[PDB]
Design a protein around this nucleic acid. Structure first.
Ligand SMILES: [Zn+2]
Lengths: 293, 206, 90, 147, 227, 76, 97, 179, 42, 35, 55
RNA sequence: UAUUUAAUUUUUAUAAUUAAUAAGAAAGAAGAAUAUAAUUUA
RNA sequence: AAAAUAAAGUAUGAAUUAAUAUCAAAAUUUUAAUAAAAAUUAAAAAAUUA
């Protein structure tokens, strides 16, 4: 159900192993346990196995079988061939979101006649303002994203100092996103809206009308990459002008958001092709829209 | 190629010069400082007020890796001016927060400025240029001494306004998130440990 | 002041101190002229069958600081058109 | 259907003065612009005066926003913009016959002479257009993609 | 309700502030007498949440008088306690404000508060008064002497003249205070206040009159000095 | 003790005076309107002690004034 | 057309040309008050200039427009002028047939 | 009053003190020496007992109850600590939060899962609380002088902790008595 | 009870009761063949 | 919640994006496909 | 009130931020450049100068 | 009113290493108030 | 549940009540009848409002 299949550590060993079990001598992997060099430390009633027909033969079958039918065993290749780092691991990787603004409300129709109520969010400037890893520990990494370029004198003097240190243009607002080390983008990166795919789900954190709220499921409807808008099939209870922290909803009940069936994200971030210039581009042809719900 | 608009004139002084944008503009707009250490030190002494101190520091902590040894020396010398061997090292306190029963003290933007400088130095002299500290003992002793002048290993006296009521602001966290910002900062950690491990070769071979 | 939170109050900075003492190892393996990222051996048996006879898999990931250091330094390559110009089906 | 009385501008000319002083000076401006592009009289048609806005906050890039002297492509490494050059705009339209090339040529000419006219502030139409009749600013608009 | 007189008093931003009163009726009555009085003499010193309300209403009256229409007049006449003031509005304000569209009234927060209660006092004037016909050179920095006397005039401006029909009204309303039954009203009011007692109200034997003939004959003197 | 009188706090940052910087005052004035009265170019949120101008604060799209040293009578 | 800030874009002309046929009966001689952003005050000041007609407002010299919007004081005048400039010709075309 | 109503609190940002770095009239760092206590194959509550004796300062002849003068015990290899017989399973640790649902009954094994060292802290707390309860400072101040490490690796090599030579005289295994 | 970074793998944390909250022990409670039983002969 | 990200609002900056313009734009795309 | 309160009970209120704020606090002020009177910024004089230029 | 809970202590650039089930210069209107951070304004 | 009215406020200034220590939070058992009594374990900061 909502539990995985239970497995105890006392049960993982040679006889329970799905593929051949491997013993580690540290320079070399063999299918025999390591025979201690000092023979007088051998225990009574313990066999030291240099060769075993039973286990060696089964292994022999397995390997030759893997090579002669590579089309059947292409899954088995996962055992022997691990994916390198970066490269968007489907299970491992988490990217950062971006900071939006609830702008207005709208109404849309799908393919059929239906009245949708859309809330439009605006992502005026999203940069990566800060990198923070806490004492170098694992899984502690944060990318801080800022929004809304802002005049020199806006903030209390102590915030302005922060932006001066960073090197980023001064922002009205920041939010941190916990991420995996592969999802890092260099400080000062301009973030686009197509960082989100039009068919995905998105976790939204904003201020209610008066504490902080989180909507974890909400799908994306439509995206303007000219006016840097984004649309949601929802009515928030929130003030117009409210900043909203966007994220990817990472899983829905045993299902990853990102997979070959569904699709793949623009992994560390969306980056634009150098040839395009939004300055030559109109509002309408700039639209990206979802498949039918 | 050509201007999309006219450019109204300025005389030599009021130009914005002294900085440069990162190699790739349309993607990364980060601003790097080109200023020489001479005039950053200059700005630091000659405009004594907090924000220009912070600005000077924030610049010379961007630029650390790109400068030679004696440049670093006159930097640290310039910076260490306002510190008493007697006094609490890094404390610059502005607001008293009387909100809860006993008074709470908030430092100003100078504190994260100095710490940011120490951390910049940590990335420079340990991570990407590990040789440089062994090369010249002059700047070794300089860094060590500036590091002893601000007292980095008792951050607790950065947050203390009265020696009778010593603050634990640096040493104490709660799970409800009190002191999340002022919580444990590795500050001199890599730097001190590393420059200990420079002296830690006890082997008779070398 | 319950028992647990006083315990963690005292011991959290000591945990930090101890893992710092773990860190200084690489530092003395740095200053001596060697530079190496301490390597973790790849674990071949992650695939199992439990007593109820069903498939259980162990997810083991290994972060590479040399990859990360480059990922925080410079931009990604250009986003492929296969991604953004077509939606993600539901 | 074809696109109606929308007219592609040549230049847009700014002034630091508000809209009320400039109405008096509108008749003398056309006379000067005419020998700026060195065309005969009646060749240039000035659009309606547009006061921009009094910005306390100063949102940049807005259709009504006070234009500033500095520009990104002009000074790349400047950490900020030079202050506000123009509080008020008026457009420059030529004859309709000119196709898209000619108008842009007359545009680049105007910026060409006007820049030097502003730097001359360190008889000919340029500084007459600058000194006794204030215009501190000029720009070439972006062609709308909206068609 | 977007119509530029009829008012909505809430605390939400769409609406102008509801200053404390008994019933929205009572509120409307108050608004009406503040407007009336402000049209009569150009400034109104007003406490509380009333002041912003009073400014906005003022701006609305000027906007109406600018419209210069029969339905506009008659709508203003519904609203005012004084018919004559409608006329003074539509005569004056159009010449006055012809060159400005927005914000015709100037609100000013005073550094003194009612001692009666902590409420703050605001000073609400119509803006530029140099185009005003009958308010031209007046100076409100301090009040006049007796409150039925025509207000002060700036020294450089002494010899100005005003619309005949306005000073007619003003003198008519003034002349009932030079009468004796007003003096009786004055003494008796002292007595009444003392009975309810408000402290620092002198005994009616000590109350000597607001108006005498000597003070008058010098007042008229300097009044024709200003003319 | 020396008398307890506070020195001039007028030029430090204040949260209630900071509200009035970007507020629209056209109705508070008559002859004398100035572009933005409460907003001091280059200085944080109106306060003169907190001056940021001609340091490196990176503000691509907004204007910044140059630095002239303030007088003594404008601070205290 | 209505709430447009600053310049009047061509995408916005499109809005006008589109809403031309939304209203079936219109002659180039139609009264001013059918226009975008034409208020009571805007209309009145136009009338004392002897202008009753969409043709007449599309005939304005644009230096009439400005002093109409500055010395006189009808705001958003350039919007109604531009709206007229746009619409006048298709009206003549739908007028012939 | 003598003691103040406004107090140092756990929520209050100033924070709770560390009595090691603290300077107070009743705290003495001068005469302290460091010990190294190997708990490998030793019974948990007995280790905790001895450690508590050194921590507290009860093992010095000049021990005065008011004065807090400890010695620092570095307790190493907690992971190897022995709990006799069935006891790892059968010996409960209880506590009550003040709220509805105020009972936690937890097997020693579970505390051990979460932290091995929190166990040692538990029985230490007990052995100190035996004589020092009625005042907070005397409960809390001693405990910080125990440094618990669940294996042989500890930062304190510079103190040169002297091996603490101790053999428990007690023959029987420990027993659990809680009323 | 999941805070901090949460990996997209559908339920890793489920069996210890849904939290990431301790994780810093190198030592645990073991039947034969579980972790610190590394050093005992069986 | 009194934090900064949640309290501060972008209202003042809305003039930077043309809400009216885009609404009319998608009304054009509303009639183009015939809804 | 179920009981008489002692002097400490009475004094506990003055530790509060509310009590301090309401009662014991100092006002910022300067001298009106026109009136030479003490003044808090944001409040003004009924005078023809103070109303125009509000200093 | 004592306890007990719930809220608040008036922008905290940022939040979660654990408990239990979090806090930078200050008070008028938070609005110069008729939802534009000035609609041109004397 | 919309509408009207009433709650920070300046000033005035009562009444019930009052054995108390700067207070008395949580749980478990016992004690001659709730037991704010004992004993044990424990973990209650200040202010303001409902
Ligand atoms: Zn004054």
């Amino acid at each position: 159900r909502c539990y995985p299949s239970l497995m105890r550590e006392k049960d993982r060993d040679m006889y329970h192993c799905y593929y051949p079990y491997l013993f580690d001598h540290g320079d070399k992997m063999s299918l025999y346990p390591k025979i201690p060099e000092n023979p007088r430390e051998w225990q009574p009633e313990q066999l030291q196995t240099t060769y075993d027909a039973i286990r060696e033969d089964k292994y022999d079958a397995f390997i030759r079988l893997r090579e002669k039918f590579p089309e059947l065993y292409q899954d088995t290749r996962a055992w022997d061939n691990p994916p390198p780092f970066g490269e968007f691991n489907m299970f491992y990787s988490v990217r950062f979101g971006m900071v939006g603004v609830k702008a207005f409300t709208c109404k849309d129709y799908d393919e059929l006649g239906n009245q949708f109520d859309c809330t439009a969010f605006w992502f005026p400037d999203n940069q990566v303002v800060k990198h923070s890893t806490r004492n170098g520990e694992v899984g502690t990494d944060k990318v801080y994203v800022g929004a809304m370029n802002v005049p020199v004198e806006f903030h209390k003097p102590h915030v302005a100092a922060f932006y001066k240190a960073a090197g980023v243009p001064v922002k009205h607002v920041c939010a941190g996103f916990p991420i995996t080390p592969d999802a890092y983008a260099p400080v000062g990166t301009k973030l686009d809206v197509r960082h989100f795919k039009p068919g995905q789900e998105v976790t939204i954190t904003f201020q209610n009308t008066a504490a902080a709220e989180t909507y974890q499921g909400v799908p994306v409807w439509r995206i303007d990459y000219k006016n840097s808008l984004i649309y949601l099939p929802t009515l928030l209870d929130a003030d117009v002008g409210t900043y909203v922290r966007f994220s990817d909803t990472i899983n829905t009940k045993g299902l990853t958001l990102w997979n070959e069936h569904r699709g793949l994200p623009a992994f560390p971030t969306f980056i634009p092709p150098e040839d395009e210039d939004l300055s030559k581009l109109a509002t309408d042809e700039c639209q990206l829209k979802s498949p039918p719900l | 190629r050509f201007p999309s608009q006219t450019m109204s004139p300025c005389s030599h002084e009021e130009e914005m010069r002294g900085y440069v944008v990162s190699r790739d503009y349309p993607l990364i707009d980060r601003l790097h400082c080109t200023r020489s250490i001479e005039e950053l030190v200059a700005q630091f002494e000659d405009r004594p007020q907090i924000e220009s101190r912070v600005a000077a520091l924030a610049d010379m902590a961007s630029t650390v890796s790109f400068r030679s040894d004696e440049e670093l020396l006159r930097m640290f010398t310039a910076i260490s001016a306002p510190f008493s061997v007697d006094g609490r090292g890094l404390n610059f306190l502005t607001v008293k927060v009387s909100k809860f029963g006993r008074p709470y003290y908030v430092p100003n933007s100078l504190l994260p400025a100095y710490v940011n400088l120490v951390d910049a130095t940590t990335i420079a002299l340990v991570r990407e240029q590990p040789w440089r500290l062994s090369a010249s003992p002059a700047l070794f002793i300089q860094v060590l001494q500036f590091m002893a002048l601000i007292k980095v290993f008792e951050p607790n006296k950065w947050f203390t306004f009265s020696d009778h009521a010593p603050s634990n602001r640096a040493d104490y966290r709660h799970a409800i998130g009190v002191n999340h910002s002022t919580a444990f900062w590795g500050t001199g950690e890599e730097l001190y440990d590393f420059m200990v491990e420079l002296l830690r070769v006890e082997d008779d071979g070398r | 002041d319950s028992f647990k939170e006083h315990y963690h109050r005292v011991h959290l900075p000591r945990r930090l101190a101890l893992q710092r003492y773990a860190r200084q190892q690489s530092l003395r393996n740095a200053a001596k002229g060697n530079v190496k990222a301490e390597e973790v051996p790849y674990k071949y048996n992650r695939w199992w069958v439990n007593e109820e006879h069903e498939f259980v898999h162990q997810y083991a990931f290994v972060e590479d600081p040399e990859v990360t250091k480059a990922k925080r330094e410079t931009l990604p390559p250009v986003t492929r058109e296969n991604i953004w110009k077509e939606p993600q089906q539901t | 259907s074809p696109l109606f009385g929308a007219r592609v501008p040549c230049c847009v000319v700014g002034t630091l003065r508000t809209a009320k002083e400039i109405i008096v000076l509108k008749r003398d401006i056309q006379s000067l612009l005419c020998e700026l592009m060195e065309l005969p009289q009646g060749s240039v048609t000035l659009g309606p005066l547009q006061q921009l806005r009094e910005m306390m906050l100063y949102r940049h890039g807005t259709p009504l926003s006070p234009r500033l002297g500095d520009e990104r492509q002009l000074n790349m490494d400047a950490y900020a913009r030079r202050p506000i050059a123009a509080r008020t705009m008026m457009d420059v339209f030529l004859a309709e016959d000119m196709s898209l090339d000619e108008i842009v040529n007359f545009g680049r000419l105007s910026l060409g002479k006007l820049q030097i006219a502003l730097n001359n502030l360190r008889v000919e139409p340029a500084q007459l257009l600058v000194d006794r009749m204030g215009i501190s600013y000029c720009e070439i608009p972006s062609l709308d993609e909206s068609d | 309700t977007t119509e530029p007189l009829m008012a909505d008093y809430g605390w939400t931003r769409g609406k102008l502030p509801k200053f404390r009163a008994r019933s929205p009726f009572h509120r409307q009555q108050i608004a009406r007498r503040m407007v009336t009085e402000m049209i009569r003499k150009d400034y109104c010193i007003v406490g509380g949440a009333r002041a912003p309300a009073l400014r906005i209403l003022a701006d609305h009256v000027v906007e109406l008088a600018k419209a210069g229409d029969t339905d506009s007049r008659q709508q203003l006449a519904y609203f005012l306690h004084d018919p004559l003031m409608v006329d003074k509005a539509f005569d004056e304000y159009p010449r006055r404000f012809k060159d400005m569209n927005a914000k015709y009234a100037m609100m000013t927060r005073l550094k003194s508060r009612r001692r009666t209660d902590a409420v703050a006092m605001y000073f609400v004037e119509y803006k530029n008064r140099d185009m005003s016909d009958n308010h031209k050179g007046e100076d409100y920095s301090a009040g006049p002497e007796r409150f039925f006397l025509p207000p002060r005039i700036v020294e450089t401006e002494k010899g100005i003249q005003r619309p005949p029909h306005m000073q007619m009204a003003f003198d008519r309303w003034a002349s009932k205070f030079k009468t004796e039954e007003f003096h009786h009203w004055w003494r008796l009011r002292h007595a009444k206040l003392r009975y309810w007692g408000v402290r620092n109200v002198p005994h009616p034997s000590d109350v000597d009159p607001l108006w005498t003939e000597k003070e008058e004959e010098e007042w008229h003197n300097e009044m024709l000095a200003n003319t | 003790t020396p008398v307890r009188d506070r020195k001039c706090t007028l030029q430090y940052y204040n949260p209630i005076r900071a509200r009035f910087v970007y507020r629209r005052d056209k109705p508070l004035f008559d002859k004398y309107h100035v572009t933005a009265r409460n907003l001091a170019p280059g200085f944080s949120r109106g306060a003169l002690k907190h001056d940021w101008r001609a340091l490196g604060v990176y503000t691509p799209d907004h204007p910044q004034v140059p630095y002239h040293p303030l007088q003594t009578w404008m601070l205290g | 057309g209505i709430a447009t800030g600053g310049r009047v874009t061509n995408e916005d002309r499109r809005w006008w040309l589109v809403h031309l046929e939304c209203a079936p009966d219109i002659t180039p001689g139609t009264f001013i008050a059918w226009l975008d952003c034409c208020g009571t005050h805007t209309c009145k000041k136009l009338i004392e200039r002897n202008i009753w007609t969409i043709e007449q407002v599309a005939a304005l010299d644009s230096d009439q427009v400005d002093e109409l919007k500055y010395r006189e004081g009808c705001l958003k005048m350039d919007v109604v002028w531009e709206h007229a400039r746009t619409i006048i010709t298709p009206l003549r075309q739908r007028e012939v047939t | 009053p003598f003691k103040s109503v406004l107090r140092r609190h756990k929520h209050h940002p100033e924070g709770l003190p560390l009595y090691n770095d603290m300077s107070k009239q009743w705290l003495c760092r001068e005469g302290e020496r460091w010990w190294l206590l190997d708990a490998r194959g030793e019974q948990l509550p007995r280790v905790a007992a001895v450690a508590a004796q050194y921590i507290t300062g009860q093992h010095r002849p000049d021990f005065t109850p008011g004065m807090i003068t400890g010695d620092h015990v570095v307790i190493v290899n907690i992971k190897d600590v022995v709990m006799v017989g069935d006891q790892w399973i059968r010996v409960p640790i209880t506590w009550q939060t003040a709220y509805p649902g105020g009972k936690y009954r937890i097997r020693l094994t579970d505390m051990y899962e979460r932290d091995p060292c929190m166990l040692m802290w538990w029985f230490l707390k007990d052995e100190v609380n035996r004589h020092f309860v009625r005042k907070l400072k005397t409960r809390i101040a001693p405990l910080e002088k125990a440094w618990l490490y669940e294996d042989s690796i500890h930062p304190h090599a510079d103190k040169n902790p002297r091996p603490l030579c101790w053999t428990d005289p007690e023959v029987k295994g420990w027993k659990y008595r809680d009323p | 009870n999941l805070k901090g970074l949460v990996y997209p793998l559908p339920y890793y944390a489920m069996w210890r009761g849904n939290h990431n909250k301790y994780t810093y022990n190198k030592s645990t409670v073991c039947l034969w063949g579980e972790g610190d039983t590394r050093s005992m002969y069986h | 919640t009194n934090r900064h990200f949640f309290v501060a609002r972008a209202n003042a900056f809305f003039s930077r994006l043309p809400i009216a313009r885009v609404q009319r734009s998608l009304a054009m795309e509303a009639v183009r496909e015939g809804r | 009130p179920k009981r008489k309160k002692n002097p400490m009970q009475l004094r506990r209120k003055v530790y509060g931020l509310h009590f301090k704020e309401k009662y014991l606090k100092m006002e910022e002020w300067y001298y009106c450049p026109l009136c030479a009177e003490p003044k808090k910024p944001g409040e003004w004089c009924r005078r023809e100068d103070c109303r125009q230029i509000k200093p």
